Amino acid sequence: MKIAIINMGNNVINFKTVPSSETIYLFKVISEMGLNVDIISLKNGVYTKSFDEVDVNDYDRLIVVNSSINFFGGKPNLAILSAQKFMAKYKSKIYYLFTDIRLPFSQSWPNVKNRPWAYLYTEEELLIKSPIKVISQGINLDIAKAAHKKVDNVIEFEYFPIEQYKIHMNDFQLSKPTKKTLDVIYGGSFRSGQRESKMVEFLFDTGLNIEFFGNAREKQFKNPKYPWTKAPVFTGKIPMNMVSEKNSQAIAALIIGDKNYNDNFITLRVWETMASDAVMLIDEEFDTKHRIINDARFYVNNRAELIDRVNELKHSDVLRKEMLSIQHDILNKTRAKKAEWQDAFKKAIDL
Numbered sequence: 001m002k003i004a005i006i007n008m009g010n011n012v013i014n015f016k017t018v019p020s021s022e023t024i025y026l027f028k029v030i031s032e033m034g035l036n037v038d039i040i041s042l043k044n045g046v047y048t049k050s051f052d053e054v055d056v057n058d059y060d061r062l063i064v065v066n067s068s069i070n071f072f073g074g075k076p077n078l079a080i081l082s083a084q085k086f087m088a089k090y091k092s093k094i095y096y097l098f099t100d101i102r103l104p105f106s107q108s109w110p111n112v113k114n115r116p117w118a119y120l121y122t123e124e125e126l127l128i129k130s131p132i133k134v135i136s137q138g139i140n141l142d143i144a145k146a147a148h149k150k151v152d153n154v155i156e157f158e159y160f161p162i163e164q165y166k167i168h169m170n171d172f173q174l175s176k177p178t179k180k181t182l183d184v185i186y187g188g189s190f191r192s193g194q195r196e197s198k199m200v201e202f203l204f205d206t207g208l209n210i211e212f213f214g215n216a217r218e219k220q221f222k223n224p225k226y227p228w229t230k231a232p233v234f235t236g237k238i239p240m241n242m243v244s245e246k247n248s249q250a251i252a253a254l255i256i257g258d259k260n261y262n263d264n265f266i267t268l269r270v271w272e273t274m275a276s277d278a279v280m281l282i283d284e285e286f287d288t289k290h291r292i293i294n295d296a297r298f299y300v301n302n303r304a305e306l307i308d309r310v311n312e313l314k315h316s317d318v319l320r321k322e323m324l325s326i327q328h329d330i331l332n333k334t335r336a337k338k339a340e341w342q343d344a345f346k347k348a349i350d351l
Ligand SMILES: O=c1ccn([C@@H]2O[C@H](COP(=O)(O)OP(=O)(O)O)[C@@H](O)[C@H]2O)c(=O)[nH]1
Pocket: 018, 187, 188, 189, 190, 191, 213, 214, 215, 236, 237, 238, 239, 240, 241, 243, 256, 257, 258, 267, 268, 269, 272
C-alpha cells in the first residue's frame, strides 16, 4: 500500500507558505497513522519527490489537496499544470480533499485552451478522466455536490473532518498562558469578500483593540453593503505553524465562516483557536446548535454582544481562565478520539 499526496495548484517545499504547510501536515498525519506516503511536487526537496521522477501509477492511492486552478499574469503556472498532467496519467480513483468551499475540483483545460500559451499543452495531456471521490470537510454533501455539478467524473462524496489534523499531530501542544497585548484577534485572508459582512460586523467599529493578521488589507473592504468608519489593525501574514501562538496574544479570538460553512464546516481556525491561550468567541450563526462547545458564553450574536463578552473577560480574569479551561478540556475530549478519526480517514480512502 503506497500512497501519493499532491497539492493541485501550489508548490510544496516547507512551512514558509500555507498551501505547502497544509500539504506537509497532511503528509505527516497520514504517515503518523502507519501509512506509507510520499508528497509529489515540482521538484525534489526535504518532503517531496518530483512529478518528473516518479510514476503516478506506482501508487495505490492518489490523494489531492484542493486548490484554485486560475491563471494570472504571464508564464504558465506549472504548479497547476504539472499537477493535472500527473493526475491525468493516473488510472485509478482520485481522492480529492475538499477543505475550502471555493476550491472544488475543476478541469484546467477549459481555462488553458484559450490562453496565448495554450499551444504548449493538449487536452489529452491535461484532461483528467479517472473517477473522483470528494472527501468533504463539510457535513452537508449537497453543498459539496452543487460545487462540483460541472464535473462529470466526480462520482462519490463522503464527509470527513479533515481539518482535525492540527490537533492529532504527535507533537501537538496547547498554548501556554501569554501576556496579552490585544482584545480580539483574527487571522486569515479576504477570501475574495465571501465573508466581508461578518468581518465588518465583528472586527470593525468595536472600539476595542483588534488585530486582523494574514493576507487581508484594509483597502479591500469597500463593499457599499457593509460600511465602516474605524478598521482593526492589519498586520502581515505569518507561518501556519505559528498561528496558535499568534492567537494567544489576544484575550479572545473570533470564529466566523462563509455562509455555506455555517452549521456545516468546522474549520482549522476552530482548533487553532481552541488550542490557543485566547478565549474562542463564535458567531452564533456559524454554530447555531452550539455543537463546538455547549456553553453560551462562547457565542456572540452580533457586534454588541462581542463587545460585551470581551469586556467581561477583561474585567474578570477568573471568568477568562475558567472559559479557557473549559475549551481546553473539550479540545482534549476530541483528541481522545484520535483512533476513531484515523480509522475514519482510512475508510474514506478505501483502506
Ligand atoms: O497569517 C496567517 C493567517 C492565516 N493562516 C492560516 O489560514 C487559515 C485561515 O484561512 P481562511 O482565511 O481561508 O479562512 P477559513 O475559511 O479557513 O476560516 C488559518 O486557520 C491559518 O491556518 C496562516 O497560516 N497565517
